[PDB]
Design a protein around this ligand. Sequence first.
Ligand SMILES: [Mg+2]
Ligand SMILES: [Mg+2]
Ligand SMILES: [Mg+2]
Ligand SMILES: [Mg+2]
Ligand SMILES: [Mg+2]
Ligand SMILES: [Zn+2]
Ligand SMILES: [Zn+2]
Lengths: 176, 97, 131, 162, 38, 222, 45, 68
Amino acid sequence: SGMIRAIVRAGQARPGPPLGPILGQRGVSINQFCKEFNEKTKDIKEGIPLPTKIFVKPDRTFEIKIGQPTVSYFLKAAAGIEKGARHTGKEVAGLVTLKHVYEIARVKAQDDAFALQDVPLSSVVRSIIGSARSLGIRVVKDLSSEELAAFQKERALFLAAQREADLAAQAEAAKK
Amino acid sequence: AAALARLGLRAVKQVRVQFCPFEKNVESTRTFLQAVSSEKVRCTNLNCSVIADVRHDGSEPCVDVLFGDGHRLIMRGAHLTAQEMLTAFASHIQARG
Amino acid sequence: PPPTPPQEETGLVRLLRREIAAVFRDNRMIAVCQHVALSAEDKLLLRHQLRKHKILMKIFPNQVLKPFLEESKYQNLLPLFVGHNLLLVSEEPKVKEMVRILKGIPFLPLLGGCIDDTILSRQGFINYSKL
Amino acid sequence: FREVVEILDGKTTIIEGRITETPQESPNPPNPTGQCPICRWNLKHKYNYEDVLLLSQFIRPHGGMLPRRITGLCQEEHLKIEECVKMAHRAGLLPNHRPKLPEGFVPKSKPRLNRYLTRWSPRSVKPIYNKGHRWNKVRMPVGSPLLKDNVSYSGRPLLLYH
Amino acid sequence: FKTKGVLKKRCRDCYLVKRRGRWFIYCKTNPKHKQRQM
Amino acid sequence: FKTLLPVPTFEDVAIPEKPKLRFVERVPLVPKVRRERKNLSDIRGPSTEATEFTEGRFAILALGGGYLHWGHFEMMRLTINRSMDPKNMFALWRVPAPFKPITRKGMGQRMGGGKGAIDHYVTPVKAGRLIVEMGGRCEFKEVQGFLDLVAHKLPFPAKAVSRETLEKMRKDQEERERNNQNPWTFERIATANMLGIRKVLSPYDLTHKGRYWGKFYTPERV
Amino acid sequence: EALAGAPLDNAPKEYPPKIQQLVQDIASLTLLEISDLNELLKKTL
Amino acid sequence: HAMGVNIYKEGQDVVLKPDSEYPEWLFEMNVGPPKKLEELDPETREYWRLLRKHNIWRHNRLSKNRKF
RNA sequence: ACCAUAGUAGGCCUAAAAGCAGCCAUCAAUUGAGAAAGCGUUAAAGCUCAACAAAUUCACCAACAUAAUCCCAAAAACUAAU
Ligand SMILES: [Mg+2]
Ligand SMILES: [Mg+2]
Ligand SMILES: [Mg+2]
Ligand SMILES: [Mg+2]
Ligand SMILES: [Mg+2]
Ligand SMILES: [Zn+2]
Ligand SMILES: [Zn+2]
């Protein structure tokens, strides 16, 4: 009856929302899909939520295609941060170099979308940089020693800003 | 191409288009081809095949369409306009089928 | 009529002219195939099946393609471009491999073309293929 | 002038275009530099609804107007000619340019009221019950304002309302 | 139908037609968009 | 195929704080005690003040004369304030808050007895004056779209204009008057008192030149 | 300049001028220049 | 999960190739300054991409008044 | 008329905010298509707009019910009018 885009964590597939309202509305077995999906995704111990394309057929049976995990995750891990910037570009979330983006790129080159496209890795790296811009993550050419000088400064500043934001969020939760 | 999709092409068996690319008069038949070949009309029924016959020498462009009424509709585009072919196609192949 | 207001070439037009000149220089096999409406999925699949034999596809507007081609040595291809079209570009050509994929889709015609300076109809490509 | 023919033979239908001979523009126009067809014959501001020989040249055998880009009329003059053709139809000129319908000629209606120079369509017009006095008066339109530039030999402007 | 002094299309499906010496707005999708110029 | 065109870019536009229209007061802070006679002569004829643009590139232009009272101000304020992007546009009052006392008597009074009591205040607006001035990184068309509403709901006839539109219609206005084919202009006749026509004319006409009559202004009049 | 006009299936009997003048320049050679020709074509290809 | 990377931990949690192994393009790409209109050459394709984008933005702003 | 595929459910707050309660960036694949101008959804999915290609007559604004005994000259678009 159509298609479904489902972004789901590595070892986690559960018979409730999102899968319950989504797959349950199409008339498709939830448990069979949890079984197959977990069969395929228990082999990734990297713990990466992957967007996946679920083809849901007229007879209520189904097919499944697993793609590469989200760039949001790959970059959240590359900068070592947890959540992305509240105000992006106004503030910084995390830092990365050429190497991170390149790795993530040749990883996502086998993604369903970039597979059919014969595009070189320069293009995919462009894509990932762009995806970094909005995630609040900053690239630098050669940062390594200053990568750690940074991390010891930047992390303290991000803790300062996250604690200040948590305090101001406590004050705005109390004022509300 | 939109007016063909609304009209439920599933009543058709086989559609072939025979035309001669290097002639000056073939634009009409080509327009008809690209109007029938579109995804809407093509997906209305999968039991129908669309064949493009391309020859240099034939010199006379033509459109032949069989459908399950036991009917055969052959319109020779020479001096015929695209949307005249498509309107004829519509009123002919819909009202009968 | 009022006197004549000559229009001026944009950067777009010059870039397209350059690009097309290069296109006619580089590829040995340029095959005109009428552009036909397909799903985005199917068009991607087609592009990829052309990527497997390394053949590339290109699309240019009739507006800037027609004058270039009538002033070109290739002007005999003018009657081909009157409708919609798609230009199949091939460096170090193998025609039978293109015909293999075109065979799969019956409603997607190959019209004219030029293989190593030889201007051919579809039958010329059928002949070059079996060779 | 290109006729389209359709034939039915043994569950096979053939539709084909066929070209006939088109008459050509008369050899020697008075104002050859002139852009628009009306103007190079010096007919600007001269033809009226009454001149049929001119009007019948742009229309279809079934009585409707020919499109502008085909004819090549200056936009203004196209509108004028269209008005005139409507008026001429209504006036009972061009009786041969109607569509032919074998059934409907038989059922007589009250004999056609003779009219001329009629701007609106007969079916669309409410009878004016209230007239009105000298100072506020409802006037009845005659002819079309598109023609108000026709050359007047009397010198008095045409009267468009009474 | 509503008699109005100003006609305006309320959606993309409204079309605008001159009948009986008036202007009209007919709409096939939403009949509620019908309008007759006064 | 269609060739593109360079898009208008605004790097020079500086947006002020409080871009939205200020709230204006129903009655002035120092309410006028002494009742004023009504000059109708302050609605009459062409406007002197507020004829030109200042900061902004768009405006509402008054084609008639009239009186703006508080209701009108409220209308404009609310409408413009929720029809604009506070980031990209700013608006400005080209009109003062209503200062002119206007009286009434209780309905049902006989004629005479004195002047009335002060009911409300208004602002006089002479034709040719800008009511509200909007600047921003906007193109004229959006602003035009919603400004024409406000314009339409004003007491006098009014338009939405830009700098370009205004200068366009002024040059058109003078070009119409040097094109004129007929020898006889209202100016030429009135000033020279031809036909003793001054008898029927007002003195003000010598300035107004038949373009303004009462509070009405007809732009077509050369 | 311009390129070929692409004759085709229904009637094409026409072979190029080049092939014919080449077979004509081949037929006019003595067998010592035919063996020279054969050697010079055997080596390159 | 969560990972705290230092110069010991960012290199130990990843396999980081030498600087001579990495391709050229990786160093050329602009890190943080997304390009402007005036900067680009009108004879370059990217310029026209950007101009198209801006034209779309403009159309989008102009379409804010839709009744439909 | 025509057509709609890519990172990607962009980052956040929220039960959920998947182009489209809100706040911030507004980059990037493909000849070409906005981190989206309207509809739509609980969040989607789904319809359209702008984009390619296809083409190209012209297209900015303008329209507004009514009274009381019975409508109220008759009529009329050209033979020459400062
Ligand atoms: Mg008003
Ligand atoms: Mg792009
Ligand atoms: Mg579109
Ligand atoms: Mg009523
Ligand atoms: Mg009477
Ligand atoms: Zn003309
Ligand atoms: Zn509607």
